[PDB]
Design an enzyme around this catalytic site. Structure first.
Site, short mmCIF file in Angstrom:
data_model
loop_
_atom_site.label_atom_id
_atom_site.label_comp_id
_atom_site.label_asym_id
_atom_site.label_seq_id
_atom_site.Cartn_x
_atom_site.Cartn_y
_atom_site.Cartn_z
N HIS A 77 0.84 -1.19 0.00
CA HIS A 77 0.00 0.00 0.00
C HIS A 77 0.88 1.25 0.00
CE1 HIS A 77 0.09 -0.21 4.49
NE2 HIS A 77 -0.19 1.08 4.46
N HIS A 79 1.70 3.85 1.87
CA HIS A 79 2.04 4.58 3.09
C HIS A 79 3.54 4.44 3.36
CE1 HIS A 79 -2.27 4.84 5.01
NE2 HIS A 79 -2.04 5.79 4.12
N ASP A 81 5.55 3.36 5.75
CA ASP A 81 6.12 2.09 6.18
C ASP A 81 6.24 1.04 5.07
OD1 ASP A 81 3.31 1.81 6.10
OD2 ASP A 81 3.31 0.29 7.69
N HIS A 140 -7.64 -1.13 5.23
CA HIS A 140 -6.74 -0.19 5.90
C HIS A 140 -6.58 1.05 5.01
CE1 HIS A 140 -3.33 1.61 7.84
NE2 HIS A 140 -2.58 1.44 6.76
N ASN A 171 -4.18 4.04 11.93
CA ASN A 171 -4.64 5.20 11.16
C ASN A 171 -5.82 4.79 10.27
OD1 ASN A 171 -5.00 7.22 9.18
ND2 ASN A 171 -2.82 7.76 9.16
#
Ligand SMILES: [Zn+2]
Length: 218
Positions: A77, A79, A81, A140, A171
């Site tokens: 994804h 993000h 991280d 997510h 989040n």
């Protein structure tokens, strides 16, 4: 077997013969899990790290360890991280695989763009190592995908799956909380015989982690 750096921010633990889990702490240290696949034709990672410094350090570690090139990385994804070290990947000739949507969102979030090659169901083989990427729907994030290793029946859930001690979904500003449950159900329906499950962060577990996450979403 586990292998870390002097600072302890980067750790790699062996799951089996050619599968390892890489974990990095993003400073309050915040961990993130990914996989390191040791294949006959190079190293393959599932997810990079928080930033370019950590990602480069991670790559330097495994390459020195296995004495081979990291050839591909699957981004779950858009993000930090997961895609934080995209610039490092691109400068080292590492193929950054991702769905088109993940590439679109990476651009929107200010990150360099990954390949956008992954379809809803994409099977990749690196040497003898088989990998299947699957887009189960929104959870997510709108773009989150899971990775399945059919030879080991190992499921990399990414941040779509929470760990056993996790009581917080994390989040949810970019999350589709209501659809998240259906997406997890799609993973469960697709893979009827799961062994190990790697959560986005936290300890490796089993199918019970998916049930735990559904519980949190109730
Ligand atoms: Zn995320």
């Amino acid at each position: 077997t586990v292998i870390k750096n002097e600072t302890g921010t980067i750790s790699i633990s062996q799951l089996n013969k050619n599968v390892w889990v890489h974990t990095e702490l993003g400073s309050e240290a915040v961990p993130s899990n990914g996989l390191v696949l040791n294949t006959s034709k190079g190293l393959v990672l599932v997810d990079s790290s928080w930033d370019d410094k950590l990602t480069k350090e991670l790559i330097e570690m495994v390459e020195k360890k296995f004495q081979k090139r990291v050839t591909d990385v699957i981004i779950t994804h858009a993000h930090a991280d997961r895609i934080g070290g995209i610039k490092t990947l691109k400068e080292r000739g590492i193929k950054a695989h991702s769905t088109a949507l993940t590439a679109e969102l990476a651009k929107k979030n200010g990150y360099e763009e990954p390949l956008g090659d992954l379809q809803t169901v994409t099977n990749l083989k690196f040497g003898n190592m088989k990998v299947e990427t699957f887009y189960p729907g929104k959870g997510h994030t709108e773009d989150n995908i899971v990775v399945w290793l059919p030879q080991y029946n190992i499921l990399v859930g990414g941040c779509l799956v929470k760990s056993t001690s996790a009581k917080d979904l994390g989040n949810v500003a970019d999350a589709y909380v209501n659809e998240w449950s259906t997406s997890i159900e799609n993973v469960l329906k697709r893979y009827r015989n799961i062994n190990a499950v790697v959560p986005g962060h936290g300890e490796v577990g089993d199918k019970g982690l998916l049930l735990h996450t559904l519980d949190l979403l109730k």
